[PDB]
């Protein structure tokens, strides 16, 4: 009969659960036509992790494994393991190794190696195209490209540290709501966290939005997550039984005690608000969500 709670961390004290970034703004977009079915940052209110969601902030969009060999530039093939170093078992009921990126694009980062007295080391910038046919993490194998042409070692322990995107040009295929093909071509994704949507008229999804760095080119790309990584960590530990399908939360200014607005926090781990407008939410950065009650569909959210 443990009471349900949320972290009392403010917006400026929260981290994106789909990419290692601080939360920048709250965001809505009712006109979104795409299916919202991200796999990272997915956790039920009673603490069940879903999709490819794991607890470490360092784990998000990260890869561990070993380069097997070199294969449009300098490309490398890499077997991927679980983040804890154990081999990935494709027969597990997960879409891909936990922490695998859940969107289409050219993910920019650093590949580093420490060889199996003192071991030798190297690190270089790298790009992983998650839309590519050779992106098959569910099969335990992915590909990455480097500006560096030769200084990558085969058969040695390898780590990918995500930094941002390589590009958001048309030919870079950045779409945050398009899932990768985890097993590659002509196979379907499996064990996916369910899609999310508002089921009541006048409501839209509320996102925690972070802006993502770019290696080059023009753009201000953003990543929207359903719940911050701190919420995932919190919900998992508490494992508080959900007493309805919807928790009523209020976004509160602690300095004034004023309720800026209220939202529904749904069982599958996402928020909805009564808002017609799209774009960022004008609110103080020291604001936070407060859990006030378990409600049902008879409760109607006040307009935002």
């Amino acid at each position, epitope marked *: *009969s443990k*009471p*349900f709670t949320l972290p009392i961390l403010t917006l400026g004290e929260l981290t994106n659960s789909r990419f290692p970034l601080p939360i920048d703004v709250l965001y809505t977009n009712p006109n979104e036509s795409a299916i919202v079915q991200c796999q990272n940052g997915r956790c039920t209110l009673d603490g069940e992790l879903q999709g490819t969601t794991q607890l470490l902030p360092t784990g998000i969009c990260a890869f561990r494994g070993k380069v097997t060999q070199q294969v449009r530039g300098t490309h490398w093939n890499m077997t991927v393991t679980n983040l804890n170093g154990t081999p990935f078992d494709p027969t597990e009921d997960v879409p891909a190794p936990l922490g695998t990126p859940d969107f289409s694009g050219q993910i920019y980062g650093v590949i580093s190696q420490r060889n199996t007295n003192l071991p030798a080391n190297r690190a270089h910038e790298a790009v992983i195209a998650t839309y590519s046919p050779k992106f098959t993490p569910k099969l335990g194998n992915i590909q990455f490209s480097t500006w560096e042409t030769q200084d990558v070692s085969s058969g040695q322990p390898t780590k990918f540290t995500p930094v941002g995107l390589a590009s958001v040009d048309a030919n870079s295929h950045f779409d945050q709501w398009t899932l990768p093909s985890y097993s590659g071509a002509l196979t379907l994704n499996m064990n996916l966290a369910p899609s999310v949507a508002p089921v009541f008229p006048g409501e839209c999804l509320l996102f925690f939005r972070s802006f993502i760095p770019l290696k080059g080119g023009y753009g201000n790309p953003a990543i929207d997550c359903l719940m911050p990584q701190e919420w995932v960590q919190h919900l998992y530990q508490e494992s508080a039984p959900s*007493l*309805s399908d919807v928790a*009523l939360v209020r976004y509160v200014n602690p300095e004034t005690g004023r309720t800026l607005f*209220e939202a529904k926090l749904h069982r599958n781990g996402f928020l909805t608000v*009564a808002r017609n407008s799209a774009g960022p939410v004008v609110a103080p950065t020291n604001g936070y969500f407060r*859990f*006030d*009650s*378990w*409600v*049902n569909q*008879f*409760y*109607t*959210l*006040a*307009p935002m």
Partner: nanobody
Amino acid sequence: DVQLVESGGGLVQPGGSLRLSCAASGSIFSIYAMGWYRQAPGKQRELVASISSGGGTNYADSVKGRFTISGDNAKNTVYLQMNSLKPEDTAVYYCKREDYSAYAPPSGSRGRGTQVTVSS
């Protein structure tokens, strides 16, 4: 353990107006939603209007623009102002309340209902 006392039923000339009131007492919670359902003769129950403690309101499309729901929190009472009534609004009107808690599932209560008849 919540009690609902309804009032304001009766016969009304078409084009006229009526005011329904529902007062809640007992084990009520600060977070809640109160509303009205109706059952027309030879028909099933349908939502008319509801109001929530946060200030949100919901209306059936059939009564939008004619009916207004509101509340006086000091009296723990909600009101249904029914204007521009037509014969099709003839029904038994039921008061419904959901009481909400952080520590328990939602708890529901309902009223006995009042007859509202609209006819020349």
